[PDB]
Write a protein that binds this ligand. Structure first.
Ligand code: HEM
Ligand code: HEM
Ligand code: ZNH
Ligand code: ZNH
Lengths: 141, 146, 141, 146
């Protein structure tokens, strides 16, 4: 469960990401494809070379979804309802992969947010991605 | 431990610029703040209630050093982690009773910290090596569990 | 999520279990300790030898908490309120370990109730225990 | 494969009494039913709507046999699982696109299946032994993932 502090922490941290979100999402994704090769089995139709337009593209898409969750941090289940249905009925991604991507977002944000990636935030960000993950994974069976 | 020359180079290359004393402190303290449940093993470190209490705790820092200490001994023996860490494994199992699952939490946090300290320099390719490396050590610390 | 058919499959399967509950609980526990040794780290104060008083009584407790969960299948979070506070604030068992008990229960059941372990019941049983796991870890952070 | 002699033996002996045709079918079968997400990979097998269809589905059964058939060969190569499943691996990764996470699911479904057919004879010690093969077999299959 996110606490009042946790939320403030996510909004402040996310706010600083600002117009770079898209740029970050892609990197998050590329760090993922590299460190955890298995995750690629979900993207056989994707061109996975460094600097790929589909990766930049999906990158933005992931960052927009996340941005929207921060926008509706008090009602995420209904905010992401759409995305949840997608991943549970069409994509059918195994839950562990969500932890991998989450971990990769953390590295990515920590590589660009020196001053803001404080312990307290790292803890709040880690909980939020866990929430986003649990929602997207909620209707699996 | 499938580690290629280029990966090993990166791994070792990067580790050369790391202040073990400092990085360790950050790493263990963050593990104690980002995954509170892991405090279950350190009730004797004193104040762990809020972040500053953890990050600042002088025993948390002293211990951090210790851990990261042995972690370097591993990088100097990437070809035989299981042997290097054998006694340490029996320890975390027989005496401390630490669920090996916790070894990966520390690892990933470690990765996060290196990222914080080096920014851009910590390229995707460099992180994949460390992911391999940290996993390696975790599997090795879990090997003597029975 | 538990559908009405699952709830019914669970109530039946567990009904047949009857007075062998605790005996199955202890068995699952044993199966777990032997198959997935890391899980022993949570019971360093227990005599873990074959069929010993501690494993037995403990297996009886686990079994009974399950009985109570079936009986309250429609209200698990409230009926398990306490066990959830306990595993979350005091035992602090890493979630992974919960799947290992569930799979072991499943094996135990499957080995003792041949006629009932149909593919439909197996399924429901799996979703059942998976839910009892979330409820027991819902207050981790 | 850290299989104890008395474990290797526990394994071998029990396999010899296995009806490959029934066990294979019930394994693959139960996987699709208990973990529907895995159906994504078999949409070409046909009617997978209901439990009864799946377990009765001939294409399902036949593949269960082909699958348990490859398992058998690994039980005879226990010392070198990696080398025995290398092909099957490049194949499940390079052409089929299966998240190796699913392997484990099949492994446990299988363990249930044995416990279901052998009741008493599937004792805790024997299960542990199998739990080891199922993991061993899963890693070998994920071994060449890139
Ligand atoms: C790179 C991973 C890790 C390494 C290399 C490592 C190594 C060590 C070392 C060298 C010691 C001191 C040895 C001694 O006292 O004789 C130690 C102690 C200890 N370790 Fe680890 N450790 C790691 C991760 C963890 C994790 C994640 C935990 C718990 C979640 C843990 C739990 C403990 C505990 C409770 C002690 C005893 C501390 C005391 O009271 O002095 N270790 N570990
Ligand atoms: C226990 C570990 C497994 C083993 C040893 C195994 C082995 C095999 C074998 C021998 C084949 C036949 C290849 C051929 O005939 O050319 C095959 C095909 C296949 N396997 Fe696996 N398998 C395992 C688990 C899985 C699981 C978990 C999935 C996904 C749920 C999967 C997905 C597939 C698919 C989609 C095919 C192609 C079938 C076809 O349409 O012809 N396998 N597998
Ligand atoms: C947080 C975390 C996350 C998030 C937020 C997300 C989100 C998302 C989004 C927004 C999208 C878009 C779609 C449309 O079109 O609309 C997607 C999709 C998606 N997705 Zn996911 N994801 C995720 C994770 C994930 C993972 C883990 C995976 C596996 C690996 C995935 C896989 C996916 C896929 C495959 C897709 C599809 C795309 C294409 O195909 O194009 N994913 N996704
Ligand atoms: C199904 C699922 C489940 C359930 C229902 C349960 C339940 C339970 C119960 C009822 C009890 C009793 C408490 C009192 O006192 O009252 C317990 C305890 C308990 N628990 Zn838990 N669990 C479980 C799982 C589990 C896990 C998995 C683990 C890990 C391995 C555990 C660990 C535990 C511990 C450690 C304890 C305590 C111990 C003693 O006795 O001290 N657990 N637990």
């Amino acid at each position: 469960v996110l606490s009042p502090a946790d939320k403030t922490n996510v909004k402040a941290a996310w706010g600083k990401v600002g117009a770079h979100a898209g740029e970050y999402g892609a990197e998050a994704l590329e760090r993922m494809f590299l460190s955890f090769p298995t995750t690629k089995t979900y993207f056989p139709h994707f061109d996975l070379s460094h600097g790929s337009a589909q990766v930049k593209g999906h990158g933005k898409k992931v960052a927009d979804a996340l941005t929207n969750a921060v926008a509706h941090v008090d009602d995420m289940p209904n905010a992401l309802s759409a995305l949840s249905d997608l991943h549970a009925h069409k994509l059918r991604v195994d839950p562990v992969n969500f932890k991998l991507l989450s971990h990769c977002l953390l590295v990515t944000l920590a590589a660009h947010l020196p001053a803001e990636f404080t312990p307290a935030v790292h803890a709040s960000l880690d909980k939020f991605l866990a929430s986003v993950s649990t929602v997207l994974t909620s209707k699996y069976r | 431990m499938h580690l290629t020359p280029e990966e090993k180079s990166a791994v070792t290359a990067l580790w050369g610029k790391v202040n073990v004393d400092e990085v360790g402190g950050e790493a263990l303290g963050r593990l104690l703040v980002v995954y509170p449940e892991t405090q279950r093993f350190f009730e004797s470190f004193g104040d762990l209630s809020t972040p500053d209490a953890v990050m600042g705790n002088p025993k948390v820092k002293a211990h951090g050093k210790k851990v990261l200490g042995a972690f370097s001994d591993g990088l100097a023996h990437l070809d035989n982690l299981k042997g290097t860490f054998a006694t340490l494994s029996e320890l975390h199992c027989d005496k401390l009773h630490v669920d090996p699952e916790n070894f990966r939490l520390l690892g990933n946090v470690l990765v996060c910290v290196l990222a914080h300290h080096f920014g851009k320099e910590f390229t995707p390719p460099v992180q994949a090596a460390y992911q391999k490396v940290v996993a390696g050590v975790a599997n090795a610390l879990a090997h003597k569990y029975h």
